[PDB]
Amino acid sequence: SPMYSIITPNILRLESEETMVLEAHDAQGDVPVTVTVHDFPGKLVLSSEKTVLTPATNHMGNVTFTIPANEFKSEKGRNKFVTVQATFGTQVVEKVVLVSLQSGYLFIQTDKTIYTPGSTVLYRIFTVNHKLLPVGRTVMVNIENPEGIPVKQDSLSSQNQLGVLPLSWDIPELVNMGQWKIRAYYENSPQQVFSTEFEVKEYVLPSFEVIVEPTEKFYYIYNEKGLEVTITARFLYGKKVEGTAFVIFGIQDGEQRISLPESLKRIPIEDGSGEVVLSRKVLLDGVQNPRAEDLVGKSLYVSATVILHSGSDMVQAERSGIPIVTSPYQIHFTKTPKYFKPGMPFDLMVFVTNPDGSPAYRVPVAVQGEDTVQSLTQGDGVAKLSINTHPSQKPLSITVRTKKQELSEAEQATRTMQALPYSTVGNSNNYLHLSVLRTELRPGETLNVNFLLRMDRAHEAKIRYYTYLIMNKGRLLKAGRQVREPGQDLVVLPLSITTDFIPSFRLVAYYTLIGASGQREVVADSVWVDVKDSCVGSLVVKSGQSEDRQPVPGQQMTLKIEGDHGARVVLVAVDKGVFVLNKKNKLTQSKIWDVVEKADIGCTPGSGKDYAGVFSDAGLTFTSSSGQQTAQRAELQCPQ
């Protein structure tokens, strides 16, 4: 009784290439296959892209199609579904999948970050699709007042513009101040909107940047020395500043800011560096709660005002978010799988972070039990830990604690997790572990997964291959077999990681046997791998000259751009005084990758309650003619 399976992304998209991997396990001879998609309910958006399966490919194929968007725009407030009904020879299998309206991203770039009234606004609107490629679509833009009333409306097409839409606006003279907003959204999907904020203010450009970085990015509550903050001031163009600097400290809880009257100090800066300390007596007396412990959680904030001895220019710089904490580390379980397998290593990805949020570097972690295990964090703040598991059904209570030296035991950071066992089909004890290296992988270097297996010797001849899939950015990227000769128990599959795998790929896998009374079963696994976040291509700007540095104003210089052939670059030069005055709402690769990762369908970093759970966690939909099919999804976001 051969099976026929369809594996498709859990939520479909409009006007994009969506892949549906087709397998026919234990099938003899060629089988025609036709895939048709119909609207749900009712009945034919597309019925094209049929295929012929051959044993030359080991009976595996993929059918890619792009569903037209039309019936789709009539109703949007309630989720809409489509039915993917495919016929394998004379056997028909169908599955209802959700369809989203999101079709691409709009990254808005404004040249400056603060404008004065009577000055023109120059901004661009990049148009890219889910795969980060230029697309031709129609956009709408509305520029909002501080109160939120549109002031300008426009419609543009990205056709033949290579995904860049330069635009303009001349700010009216009589306008309200404060944050403005620019909201742009694709014309087909008006319920998803992207935005940026630019500030209209009365300003004249400053002359020098003031940096306040405390010695530690926190304040120990029991430290008797007080907060140690260093104020440094350098001119814009690279010279040291002489002046006098006022500073002040306060306690920032929730949204109310209270200042410390006994804290303002004048600390003259010589050679552009000054240091002031907030004695703990001041901190305790300023607040009305003498209990020092009850002050934890609240954040300090440093407001530094610098004036030159000329007295001609004044600049303000503020560093907030200095958390008052009793422990310098915060242990997170965001990346650790929440489900494990009996009798396998259970790789823990602990994420040791500083109290502010930045990743921690070179900190030893340990497990409270079996203290013989100890590790040390990598560059990105993830420490690989391995805990062997007894073959038992009881939930495993894993607690991890930081064991840094020269830190008192009443001062480390602790955390606890509950991990539940993978549940087989009818207690058959047929699992699959998929061991792998997880590090700051760079594109190009290979990876060796370990298709580890565990099953009784009575059924070691039925399994001869391992199917695997690779999610990335929301669509299947690669899908192939992995042959394994019977009698072999570990299989290493070399994976060629190109630059196309940025930033993460959710490798899955499965096999299929018949056992017990002769009922079909499926066993799956998942792995989340984090790749270093950089371009899929490469671009960098440097200077043509190799001599006679510090160009004088009015002098030609040549800047060299080393970009990929055929590409198009867009340039902008901003005075650094603007960033001194307001450094928020910039654009960089980090935010682009954050936005792309925030839209991934998968919603758990690997493993699951069982095979249906594993597939839904990955963001897939595995249905078969026999009946073993994944659970239905009808919500855009997985539960928090």
Next chain:
Amino acid sequence: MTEDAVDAERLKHLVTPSGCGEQNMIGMTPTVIAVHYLDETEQWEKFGLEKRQGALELIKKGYTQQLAFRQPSSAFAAFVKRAPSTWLTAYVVKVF
């Protein structure tokens, strides 16, 4: 200014077609009206996405059976030998 429709949580009891023409009508009418109501109210998200295909298959089977049971004069009755019934023909017209 509107009244919320039934959540259809308890409408799960709504039968495979079988029997003669009258029994086939008895089978199809509740299932057909239930699927029509669910389509109108757009509440398939919670009643269960999979059951609609089975409902369509069974109603199509019943429709094909009654198409086979149609008299040569385009008449619907309990039996082909039995005289056609006007009420049965009108009900079949309404169902179609």
